[PDB]
Design a protein around this nucleic acid. Structure first.
Ligand code: EVP
Ligand code: EVP
Ligand code: MG
Ligand code: MG
Lengths: 775, 775
DNA sequence: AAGAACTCTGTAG
DNA sequence: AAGAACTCTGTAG
DNA sequence: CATGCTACAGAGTTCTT
DNA sequence: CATGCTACAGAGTTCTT
């Protein structure tokens, strides 16, 4: 808070207020205020003020209760959690406003410390839409008359700026779709420099002084419509399902006349802002938080995996977590933050009984934390180190499969793939619990024997249940059972009704009166468990104390209780057909729930009921990916073999060709062309680098004779040429094998999936025997 | 601080306390002390406790005053700064000690909350000797009887561990002298894995389990000698002059019998620890904070420059400060920290009037800070952008000169050069102020006309002062003047006695009574100037108020004073022959003090009196570097020309040689040898990569015929052969030019230094005209 | 009038 | 017997 | 160099009435 | 994602004492 000169004074109704979502915005606004000279309209430290929103603020909609409105008036009670928040009460004190007053007159408006609050956020997809969203939603929920009478204003900054050489006027485009339309209407992207500002601090000194010179412009007054209140309740309200039905549709872009009305006169309706920016943020947060059913993992997590694949390919040597996070932020264009990325890396590399990653993609060296703190006892990322689990990843996410995935394009540059679809569905093996903007994601691990039988029966034709499982595919029968995994769990799973329950085990010695529990349900970390068992009041009347002798990889907890209470828990706590008296006592029963909300590869939410739907949706994607990989391999291999044959023919012909007595490249190429040599680009044949079949053929119909030229002389020896003849023989044999894999009865790549299944389960067993540390 | 159970009770004399230098040691201690079950040693949080020293603490020697000792007893008064320090008073509260009591008897020691305190620091140069040194110096200064009886102990973790395959006992070597003594006494470094632990948190789980299995070992009790107190006064407290005379000698390594006495029975004398670890830290910090007189920049800054040279060589595109800092911490092995590196990068890339870097090595994009806050108002390293100043660096630190520098070896791997000696001495152009462990470094910029004349007269023989300046070299005459720079300074410099003074300029309007100052003394930050003038109580009655309208890269401050006080400052504040009444009143002067303490390339401190000594010491280094560059160029160029002539004549001969009808490499190489061909390694000739003359000749006496083999076939064309013939002609012309540069009269490479001087001054003029922002 | 406190600057923790 | 109350994860400001 | 309030959703104890 | 006490020397400007 930098108080203005005439703040809370006589001229205070003419002042403004700057609301900054970040300290980068704080730095930009400080620079703009310290400009000073040549700005008769650009305000100085006076009449400006300053307030930092502290990142994400909370909405009052889910906090207020609206109780005791039966007295003929609707009174709203602020939450006790809402009252003591620092940012909200800070902006209340700064603006000098009161909740009870309804600012329907000019005098109560003049009571305010500032004349207009002008928020200033980044133009990234969150922020404006989120921070503005919750901010003006809170303002609408408490003081709609401020928004109606023009008290809230947006400081809209350019997102993408394109400069033409010799001209100093920006195009200052504000949306990605507008920039795409301008690029398509333009003939070419020549004599133009394109700059992306994914944050306010990206602006330079000349940039900030140019945009602050016209500070009277680019400030937009918010207006409230009659239909805005319904949108405010829908996007920010207690009823989550009410937004579910409007998070499955998609963002409606603004019409050209609406944008013209916005830019001609700066009156932004709240309904349009909620429908565009807030909805776009909500869709983005759904996509960035809910895992993909093909991946089983978050977009950030798949970005981390792609960065690890690119980083540890050359060398699997040790790397620190902060360095690896910087690497994947630099190379995969992660423009969000650093310590969230480091936290995601740490959680991905964690491995212990009850950890969310049953099959982690990273080998971890350092203190990642055991099951006692649930991964919260992990150390700092600067000294914790991670390396790539080479065998598990190389069997589980094959590079040949990684070529043919769809890829996410960021600013015209390649980034992490759209999805890694693996040989076994990680949406089934992994297990975690996330919230999102409208949905919840919960999964529990299935055993790697039911899923293995299911996939093998679907793929192998020798399994007698292959036809039966295919009939289950067409008719949703689900004959084979799916059971929760028993790995790292000495308890027993039970099924009742439509729910699975996990049970810990206990030993009772009545002559010693110690309740010794050795296995506990597979998610609660045994320390929050003993804190929760220390907060139950009735159990305080029944026990004496709790001692924990549990080390890494094992659990044993001894409970001392009153000698006369040992039977009392029988009468007070109960022993139903599903749980025992002691299981009710120590809360060793745990019902496991599944909320199977996933994001489609297109981008939308798909809901599921059981894991059979997950498996039967994941199976076709691997089907056509194997199918496309096989004929891509066939085409690129026939191109490789014809190019190798051309090399051999030129090698055997150049002795009598005598091309050495030629001047330049054109004459040599003409001679090779009139000798009938095939011109094909060998740099697209030796290394194809994810080229589709039609574009590979259209690239290879033309080509260059550079494979004649770029071949080194050292291959002139006859033994080398015999080795290349043997290589040609092996390439033709591989072509025959690929062709006969294309024509097999069930589907192409039938036995192929068998050896990746065998390799994956062998590597899993190897890592499972040595605490995933391998070596 | 976590309280140990039964600590400060009946068993308090049997306790211990773990003193951790930071959270990195804290994580290892939280792991090792508990370690689950199987804990004979390393008690599971029993009688141990935990305290963090918070990095670096202060020492009590420079805080206490020892006043009023005339009453027959020496009483010591603790400083007000020492009393309210968090860490010291925290450890006082944890140990339950009192300053007044001298713990001679056993009951006073039993009063203590813990039986002993065991320090736990990294084994890095820093921390052991520094943090240990200050901690036990504070203990010695207040309670020597605790150290005498054995209250103070420390745990001595192994710095380097060598593992033999099939054997699970590490060698646990503690010093690098011991480590490379073992390496030289060993036959070979085979069947051995070497692990460096540059910090405690780098130990793994099995490593900390192995160390805590024998926790009763590796704990050493400190003992106080009669000669310890003198060394305590030498290294800490007192005066710099008392330690200067012992920071020029060097560390004395411990004898073998002393180390045997330490390891046989764990009684470490304080004198040996002070003489080895503390002195080694002092020398390291002297080398780390005092700039080299050749470079003008410290070890960290030259590390940053070398990392920038490696990073921006392939592409000079923009990189963030954090990404570049991570790059230089990775590739240049900066094992100290992260944010200090980023701060050093920011200070290196700063450029404004009065900034410490008159010729920065990095061009900047962002808010690095103007002259008003003195660079303290720079933004976060998250978004601030840096790039390499391509022209200035490429003319100023030549890559051909960068090849031949000596290099710092870190763990057998190359790192930043030992010194980046430039074509013009940055120890003269730059200006800054650094304290260190015994010395102070202050410099003031000289103008780029006196130094240009000096260097040109030393180098160019056409300058009539060349012989006179050489006579000044042999006789220390220093005929040519050296003056402080006037760049970015509208004031005037004056010389009185042996000191230069910088003056601000002022305009007086007596009818308007406003003191308008437009330029203040060299390097005074605008803000502080006003805060310090606002603290002077005697000048409060003489002024009314102060206002500042100064924008970036300009100064104008208006002072309003009392109308009757305008003459009063004439009488009370005198106007001497050297200063005006107004200059004395507004403190518009500044005396330019210079403390020319530099570090030698060997490592020692060298002191200077004037900048002529700096110039005359820097000149010979460039002399032999140009000379050795000329021999290296001549040798590698004659090898290149014989290699090129060989390839040309072999292309001409292979038509009738007919080597294609040969089987393998050995037969082909034998045929080439029997035809009289010279085997020389073309990968050592095309790219020499800093090979000295003798080792280059000894590598090139042998070699390989791979240049026959690794040549691509595409060069078979006759126009290519004519191009390589022209290239051979140009190489021979360059050989002739190099040979005639070697034989010129003053020294080899005479006119060479003329064109780098011309290029450097042209690039400097370009930077000056563009505010060091070339684009 | 002499002497104890109090900041500064880079490189560390 | 209903409701307010507080955690609990993985990505983000 | 560890850390600190928040969103979002859904259930499960727990306190509290 | 800003920030907080420290070392080290030496030369100052206020502070009393
Ligand atoms: C003061 O205004 C600002 C606030 C922030 C927040 C922030 C806010 C906090 C706070 C802590 C944080 C902290 O977040 C931490 O990140 C962790 C990483 O993600 C997941 C894994 O877990 C997160 C923690 O839950 C969270 O605590 C900052 C890290 O980067 C951010 O984006 C965070 O504790 C108090 O309020 C950023 C700013 O710069 C734009 C601001 O100007
Ligand atoms: C909580 O974690 C720890 C932090 C620290 C210190 C530290 C200590 C501080 C403090 C701040 C800092 C902070 O930097 C300070 O500011 C300076 C700013 O100019 C740069 C050039 O040099 C920085 C120094 O490094 C340090 O003087 C940390 C940065 O890296 C460190 O190592 C610093 O303010 C209060 O006490 C030590 C630890 O034990 C080993 C820790 O466990
Ligand atoms: Mg942002
Ligand atoms: Mg260290």
């Amino acid at each position: 808070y930098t108080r203005a000169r005439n703040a809370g004074g006589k001229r205070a109704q003419d002042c403004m207020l700057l609301a900054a979502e970040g300290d980068s915005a704080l730095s930009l606004l400080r620079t703009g205020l310290t400009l000073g000279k040549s700005n008769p309209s650009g305000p100085s430290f006076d009449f400006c003020g300053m307030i930092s929103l502290g990142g994400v603020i909370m909405n009052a909609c889910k906090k207020v209760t609206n109780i005791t409105t039966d007295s003929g008036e609707t009174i709203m009670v602020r939450n006790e959690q809402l009252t003591n928040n620092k940012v909200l009460q800070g902006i209340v004190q700064v603006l000098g406003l009161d909740f009870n007053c309804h600012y329907k007159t000019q005098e109560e408006r003049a009571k305010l410390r500032y004349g207009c609050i002008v928020a200033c956020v980044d133009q990234d997809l969150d922020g404006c839409g989120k921070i503005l969203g919750l901010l003006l939603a809170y303002f609408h929920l408490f003081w709609p008359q401020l928004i109606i009478h023009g008290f809230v204003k947006r400081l809209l900054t350019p997102l993408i700026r394109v400069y033409e050489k010799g001209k100093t006027m920006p195009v200052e485009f504000y949306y990605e779709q507008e920039f795409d339309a301008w690029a398509k209407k333009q003939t070419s992207l020549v004599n133009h420099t394109v700059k992306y500002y994914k944050g306010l601090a990206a602006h330079d000194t000349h940039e900030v002084k140019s945009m602050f010179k016209h500070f009277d412009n680019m400030v937009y007054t918010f207006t409230l419509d009659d239909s805005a209140k319904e949108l405010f309740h829908i996007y920010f309200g207690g009823e989550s399902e009410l937004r579910k039905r409007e998070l499955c549709t998609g963002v409606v872009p603004l019409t050209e006349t609406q944008t013209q009305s916005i830019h001609s006169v700066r009156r932004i309706p709240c309904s349009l802002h909620l429908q565009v920016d807030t909805k776009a943020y909500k869709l983005d947060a759904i996509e960035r938080q809910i895992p993909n059913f093909l991946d089983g993992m978050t977009r950030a997590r798949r970005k981390i995996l792609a960065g690890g694949v690119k980083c540890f390919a050359s060398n699997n040597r040790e790397r620190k977590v902060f360095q690896f996070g910087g690497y994947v932020a630099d190379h995969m264009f992660y423009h969000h933050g650093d310590m969230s990325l480091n936290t995601s890396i740490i959680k991905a590399a964690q491995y212990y009984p009850g950890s969310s990653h049953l099959y982690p993609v990273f080998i971890g060296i350092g203190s990642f934390g055991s099951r006692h703190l649930g991964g919260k006892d992990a150390g700092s990322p600067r000294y914790i180190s991670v390396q790539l689990a080479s065998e598990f990843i190389k069997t589980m996410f094959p590079a040949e499969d990684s070529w043919l995935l769809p890829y996410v394009f960021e600013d015209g540059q390649r980034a992490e793939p759209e999805y890694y679809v693996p040989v076994l569905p990680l949406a089934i093996m992994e297990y975690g619990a996330n919230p999102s903007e409208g949905w919840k994601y919960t999964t529990w691990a299935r055993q790697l024997e039911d899923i293995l039988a299911l996939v093998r029966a679907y793929v192998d034709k020798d399994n007698p249940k292959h036809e039966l499982l295919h009939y289950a595919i067409k008719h949703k029968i689900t004959i084979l059972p799916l059971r929760p995994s028993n790995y790292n769990f000495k308890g027993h799973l039970k099924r009742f009704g439509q729910y699975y329950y996990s049970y810990g085990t206990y030993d009772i010695s009545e002559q010693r009166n110690i309740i010794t529990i050795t296995e506990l349900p597979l998610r609660v970390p045994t320390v929050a468990y003993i804190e929760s068992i220390k907060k139950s009041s009735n159990r305080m009347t029944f026990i004496e104390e709790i001692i924990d002798y549990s080390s890494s990889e094992t659990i044993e907890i001894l409970v001392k209780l009153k000698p006369n209470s040992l039977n009392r828990i029988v009468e007070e706590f109960k022993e139903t057909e599903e749980q025992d008296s002691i299981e009710n006592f120590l809360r060793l029963r745990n019902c496991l729930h599944s909320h199977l909300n996933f994001v489609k590869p297109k981008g939308g939410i798909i809901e599921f009921n059981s894991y059979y739907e997950i498996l039967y949706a994941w199976l076709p994607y691997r089907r056509e990916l194997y199918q496309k990989r096989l004929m891509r391999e066939h085409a690129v291999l026939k191109l490789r073999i014809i190019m190798e044959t051309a090399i051999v023919r030129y090698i055997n012909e150049s002795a009598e060709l005598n091309l050495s007595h030629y001047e330049d490249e054109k004459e040599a190429s003409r001679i090779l062309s009139e000798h009938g040599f095939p011109p094909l680009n060998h740099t697209l044949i030796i290394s194809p680098e994810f080229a589709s079949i039609e574009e590979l053929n259209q690239k290879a119909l033309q080509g260059c004779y550079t494979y004649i030229l770029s071949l080194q002389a050292r291959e002139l020896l006859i033994a080398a040429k015999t080795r290349r003849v043997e290589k040609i023989k092996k390439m033709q044999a591989r072509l025959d094998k690929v062709e006969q894999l294309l024509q097999e009865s069930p589907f192409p790549g039938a036995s192929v999936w068998l050896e990746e299944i065998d390799a994956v389960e062998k590597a899993i067993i190897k890592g499972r025997n040595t605490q995933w540390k391998f070596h």
